[PDB]
Amino acid sequence: MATSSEEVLLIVKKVRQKKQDGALYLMAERIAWAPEGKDRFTISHMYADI
Amino acid sequence: TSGTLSPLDIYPKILDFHPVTMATFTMTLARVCLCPMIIGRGNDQVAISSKFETREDIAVIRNYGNLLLEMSAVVPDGIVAFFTSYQYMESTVASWYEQGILENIQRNKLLFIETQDGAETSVALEKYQEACENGRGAILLSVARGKVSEGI
Amino acid sequence: PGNDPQEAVPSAAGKQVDESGTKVDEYGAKDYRLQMPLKDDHTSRPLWVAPDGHIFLEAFSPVYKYAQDFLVAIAEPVCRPTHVHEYKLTAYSLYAAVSVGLQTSDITEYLRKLSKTGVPDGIMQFIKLCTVSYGKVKLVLKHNRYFVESCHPDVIQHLLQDPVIRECRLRNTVSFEVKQEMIEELQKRCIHLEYPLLAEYDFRNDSVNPDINIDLKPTAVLRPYQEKSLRKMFGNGRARSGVIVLPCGAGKSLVGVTAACTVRKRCLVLGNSAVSVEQWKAQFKMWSTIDDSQICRFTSDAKDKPIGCSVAISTYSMLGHTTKRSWEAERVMEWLKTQEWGLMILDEVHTIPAKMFRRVLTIVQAHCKLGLTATLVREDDKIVDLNFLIGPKLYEANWMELQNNGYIAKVQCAEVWCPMSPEFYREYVAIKTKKRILLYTMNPNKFRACQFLIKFHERRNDKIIVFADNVFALKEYAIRLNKPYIYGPTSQGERMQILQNFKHNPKINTIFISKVGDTSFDLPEANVLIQISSHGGSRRQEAQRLGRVLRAKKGMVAEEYNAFFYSLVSQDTQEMAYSTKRQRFLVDQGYSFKVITKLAGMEEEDLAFSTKEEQQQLLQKVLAATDLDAEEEV
Amino acid sequence: VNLAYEILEPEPTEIPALKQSKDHAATTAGAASLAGGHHREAWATKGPSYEDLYTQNVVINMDDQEDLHRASLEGKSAKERPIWLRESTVQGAYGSE
């Protein structure tokens, strides 16, 4: 380890969210539930407020 | 002399004669003075009225917070809102704390809600008049028959 | 011999159709259709009258204004593909009765003004006097009250049939009374024998149980794709029997429960199979209290409260076997005609023949019928229309607005034509049996493409399922490349866990299904579908499977595409007979269609059957496979 | 006097407020949530300004950083790279024009 919180977490496609099988992306320092094939993010949070 | 007294058919409630009856139209070229608007959803949700409902539903409360959040970013100055009574006003503000509606309003304008005691009401209006003139215009969340509706 | 009725009027065949020999009055009005557009843009685009009996209205720019003018014009014949771009077709037959409530003499004046100094020939003018708006209403009379609409031509032409043979107004819009209650079956056959059509409306006053008639439901309505179909099917308190079109992957069984609350009718759900029992029951839980009050299930071995409730979920009329089912089907048919006669909810009726529809109306005395089918025609038939017994075509939704909102996946159709293998083509024109079907089905040139399409989506870990009509054909397609597979003759306990291994507790990605594991217990709902065979008997069953399986990658798509849909069709195998008919249906769904005959990149890929020696060993196995290998019964 | 403070008391009160001994009310709720019964099994003091607790701390540190963007390339390769198909017409090529 380089003491930098490296290695991006595993990304899992197609995850339901109250009858909405969108897409939950696990980046580096924050979480982002990307709404299918788009550029924005519906559920936008980070690795702190959880 | 009253401006809000326009329905004259119910005026004989006092049981007094009144032969002098006349309205007022005020001929004005540009109608940019006022702009009455009525929002009632319609054939999309039809949930906007709550005359005998408290916290049994969340469709009307969500519509009151979505429209108020958008108007807080387009009005050039302050916004003076009014609710029904003290019971429905407290249930609407408390419901915004769970979904996260009142928290976004605090980002733009400053919140001002009418209290119950008369001592804390006079000091609350002075803070609203100071913020709207010096900095950004705040917002008023009071009651139609409270204390900021008699004559401000 | 001994069967010469009427009809027999269409006549158009051959390459030289030269349909220009009888027009009488048409050449004189051809010049008038040119000088009018030269004035203003509004004084143009007429209707283009034809000597046969059809007009071409506006369809180039339907926008929002002209989208409502055709809704009244289509309210007379069957529903043609309205939401298109070419020309909207309009006729006048059958359906001009259970549609709106205006006379045909009023819509004629609007057509003459659109042509701008010109009458629409004159053949269809004298026809506007057949079917009218008539029906029956159930009220306090506890039977039938004869009053329809405020119009007047709908009552004059009726006295010379029913009132001349039997009275009616005996008890105590021009309303009538009840004629001894029993007299009712003879009236339904005397009105349709002439020319007018009946349409029994709503309202009732017999057999009550669920407290009152307003139950409990939140008034906050949502989903604009269901409210627009609700006001069109039942938006005036009348009946208007027909079939509405709605997306499959949005809630087909959800619009029926919501409509049953506004209609306020003790409806009866009639599913198509076993999967329709659990779907309709799920909507009576999170939306009403009927699940634990007035619930009933005559199928799937339940019999929950046979007496005391009318809202039940059955399966058409498949519960009536001869001798084997004697007293079982008798108690179901007798006890249903007494405490139930509401709405006949129907779903997926484009594959059910007319023989089953006769037994549906016989075992129950429903006064109304409901149509919930997204397809247009039935069993791909254009010469015989058997939809007049379960409700004809009523209204279809705008697929362009449904797809560009978040109701269906962005289907990107692209046909893939693969060359035919020479080793398997020699035996195709050699034998004259049914064994030649598996020859072009097991095409090694298509198997390499079928494996390439799976690898093309394997890196994109997308929900992909290869479809196949044959049962013993998709088995080899999964063993050669190490993947699981399911088919018909398997086991109920085995498919119970494998079906959950794709939606509930998944663990396998590439699964091969057929025509059994889709409308039996749970919907597939994948994303990418591959069609191998395109010549089977199910020429219309895969139409609704395109909407149920191909779901979006979220549920509320904005404006971009992502879902893919390919099709593997063999070359020089007499398969274009069905590959051509699919183009007429895809252009009406708003899907992008294209043809890609060369994948360009299939050879440079680590696939199987690379050498010619492996393709030769498959010939010794396909011909050796016995055709009797099908189930195990005698 | 304490009996009339609740007006209607079908049971000997539930958990209204404490008014006087309020500084100790944070000790009882702090030991119940730390033991096992967390969730919302707690109370406060109606009247003054209530009280809350359980899992409310501040985090401070000084590290991390230095080479973090180099890991975004490996995680992005798990999806799909934007590329077209191997175009090959085996005849005549294009000419831009």
Tokens of C238: 């009348």
Question: Most B CBs within 10 Å: which of C222, C225, C226, C405, as the mutation test of the B interface?
Answer: C222
Cross-chain Cβ contact C557/A23 below 8 Å: no
**Residue C604: which of D79, D80, D86 has the nearest Cβ?**
D86
Tokens of C239: 């009946």
- Round to whole Å and give the CA distance between C385 and C391: 11
**Residue B46: which of C219, C224, C231 has the nearest Cβ?**
C219
Q: Which residues from D are below 8 Å from A3, CB to CB?
A: 63-64, 66
Label residues C77-97 b or e (16+ Cβ within 10 Å = b): bbbbbbbeeebbbbbbebbbb
Chain Cα centroid distance, residue C16 = 34
> How close B46 comes to chain C (CA, Å)?
6
Chain C residues 461-520 with CB within 8 Å of chain A: 461-463
- Round to whole Å and give the CA distance between C523 and C548: 7
Q: Residues near B121 by Cβ (< 8 Å), separated by ≥ 6? A: B114, B115, B147, B148
> How close C284 comes to chain B (CA, Å)?
19
- Give the containing element (helix H, strand E) for C333: helix C327-334
**A12 close to D (CB below 8 A):** no
> How close A28 comes to chain D (CA, Å)?
7
Question: Most A CBs within 10 Å: which of C254, C462, C554, C559, as the mutation test of the A interface?
Answer: C554
Handedness of CA C324, C328, C332, C338 (dihedral sign): positive
DSSP string, C24-88: SSSSTTTTHHHHTTTT-SSS-------SSS-EE---SS-TTTTTTHHHHHTSSS-----S-SS--
CA atoms within 13 A on the CB side of C172: 0
Cross-chain Cβ contact C221/B46 below 8 Å: yes
- Give the containing element (helix H, strand E) for B104: helix B102-108
Cross-chain Cβ contact D64/A4 below 8 Å: yes
Resolution in units of Å: 7.2
- Round to whole Å and give the CA distance between C622 and C437: 10
Q: Residues near C103 by Cβ (< 8 Å), separated by ≥ 6? A: C151, C153, C154
Handedness of CA B51, B53, B58, B64 (dihedral sign): positive
Nearest residue of B to residue C218 by CA position?
A: B57
Q: Residues near C441 by Cβ (< 8 Å), separated by ≥ 6? A: C470, C473, C532, C533
Q: In 3D, which of C257, C358, C264 has the Cα closest to residue C317?
A: C358
Cross-chain Cβ contact C557/A36 below 8 Å: yes
> How close D71 comes to chain C (CA, Å)?
20
Nearest residue of A to residue C463 by CA position?
A: A14
Q: CA C610, C615, C617 angle in degrees (round to 5)? A: 135
- Round to whole Å and give the CA distance between C46 and C114: 5
Cβ contact A6:A18 at 8 Å: no
Cross-chain Cβ contact D86/C459 below 8 Å: no
- Round to whole Å and give the CA distance between D29 and D37: 10
> How close C460 comes to chain A (CA, Å)?
9
Nearest residue of C to residue A14 by CA position?
A: C553
DSSP lists the bridge partners of residue C313 as: C269
Interchain touch B–A (≥3 Cβ pairs closer than 8 Å):
no
- Round to whole Å and give the CA distance between B69 and B65: 6
Residue C247 marked in a binding site = yes
Tokens of D8: 């209607």
Q: In 3D, which of C353, C441, C426 has the Cα closest to residue C390?
A: C353
Nearest residue of C to residue D88 by CA position?
A: C600
Q: Residues near C356 by Cβ (< 8 Å), separated by ≥ 6? A: C316, C317
DSSP lists the bridge partners of residue C512 as: C466
**B87: helix, coil or strand?**
helix
Tokens of B14: 């006092």
Q: Residues near C75 by Cβ (< 8 Å), separated by ≥ 6? A: C95, C96, C99, C100
DSSP string, C161-174: TSTTTS--------
Cβ contact D51:D45 at 8 Å: yes
Question: Most C CBs within 10 Å: which of A10, A11, A14, as the mutation test of the C interface?
Answer: A14
Say which experimental method was used: cryo-EM
Q: In 3D, which of C557, C507, C525, C553 has the Cα closest to residue C279?
A: C525
Tokens of C384: 């015989």
- Round to whole Å and give the CA distance between C109 and C270: 43
Chains that touch A (3 or more CB pairs under 8 A): C, D
**C609: helix, coil or strand?**
coil
Chain Cα centroid distance, residue D82 = 37
Chain Cα centroid distance, residue B92 = 13
Residue C611 has a CB neighbour count (10 Å cut-off) of: 8
Q: What is the DSSP letter of B13?
A: G
